[PDB]
Design a binder for this molecule. Sequence first.
Ligand SMILES: C=C1[C@@H]2CC[C@H]3[C@]4(C)C[C@H](O[C@H]5O[C@H](CO)[C@@H](OS(=O)(=O)O)[C@H](OS(=O)(=O)O)[C@H]5OC(=O)CC(C)C)CC(C(=O)O)(C(=O)O)[C@H]4CC[C@]3(C2)[C@H]1O
Ligand SMILES: CCCCCCCCCCCC(=O)NCCC[N+](C)(C)[O-]
Length: 292
Amino acid sequence: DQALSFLKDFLAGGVAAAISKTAVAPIERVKLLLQVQHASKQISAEKQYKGIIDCVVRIPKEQGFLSFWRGNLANVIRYFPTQALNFAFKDKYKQIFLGGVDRHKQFWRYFAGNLASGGAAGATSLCFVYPLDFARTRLAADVGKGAAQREFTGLGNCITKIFKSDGLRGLYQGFNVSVQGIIIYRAAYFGVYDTAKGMLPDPKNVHIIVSWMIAQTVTAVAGLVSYPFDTVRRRMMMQSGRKGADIMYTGTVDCWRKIAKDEGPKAFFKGAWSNVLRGMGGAFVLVLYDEI
Ligand SMILES: C=C1[C@@H]2CC[C@H]3[C@]4(C)C[C@H](O[C@H]5O[C@H](CO)[C@@H](OS(=O)(=O)O)[C@H](OS(=O)(=O)O)[C@H]5OC(=O)CC(C)C)CC(C(=O)O)(C(=O)O)[C@H]4CC[C@]3(C2)[C@H]1O
Ligand SMILES: CCCCCCCCCCCC(=O)NCCC[N+](C)(C)[O-]
């Protein structure tokens, strides 16, 4: 019950999360650039990154090797407020949406309860940490080659600059679709894993390896299914700071339509492969980390 033990666990978790996310930040930046460069003010269509390889080879000489971690501070910080918030809300939402439900005799009522609980805890946390996700994205998208060409010079600068021009709404652009995404993601994750645990994995006796790959596969699939929601989310974040006729999307719905009509249905998955890689590498660093 030691408050000390709890603090130690809390910090250790924050350290682990900070290491894995920092580790895959380069590939995450590529994912973000490909996903949002269409809505960038600095990237002309001619200078757009042609892909992962074209992207990884260009940013070092274009903006400096260190720029691979541009916007990563938000990544190492988010964990703390996020987990602090879960400590006060997470279990309460579970009790609220799942209390009294028999998991075995009421599959769907349980399923829905699970989604509402995850969705409620996620939206609640985001009410506080979303600006961090916002800045992580806007900084990642910034391709300035030096302090003078930087659209934002850092986490604090991004948040303050946007706040001054758009107020709070600017820092929360894309909030709603992100929550929809959280629910779709959770629905796909549990839906797949559920169907999975049935076929091929009897009382999990298989090697740790296959047991890991399977967990990664469920994550990748859940990430793909909800990816479109992530793309309009980030594209909306790119609107903050813009004014008048400069605004590409007037709302989430307008965003969905615009992307579909101006870029094509496949465009919703720009960066999706990079995202799959990012997720895998992230999980691989944690195991690599826990073993040291
Ligand atoms: C439209 C979308 C896409 C689909 C939904 C989300 C996540 C995948 C959704 C996700 O992560 C969520 O899903 C997990 C799996 O079901 C769930 O774990 S569980 O409780 O153990 O089941 C996490 O819960 S928490 O308890 O740890 O807090 C939950 O985190 C949140 O609620 C984090 C808030 C900051 C939002 C977190 C996250 C991640 O990459 O994994 C993260 O930022 O770290 C999001 C990335 C952004 C999108 C991508 C959003 O743009
Ligand atoms: C277990 C595998 C199931 C197969 C899943 C196949 C996913 C293909 C990705 C679909 C992307 C998606 O969700 N778009 C929802 C559009 C919703 N609106 C119209 C409101 O914008």
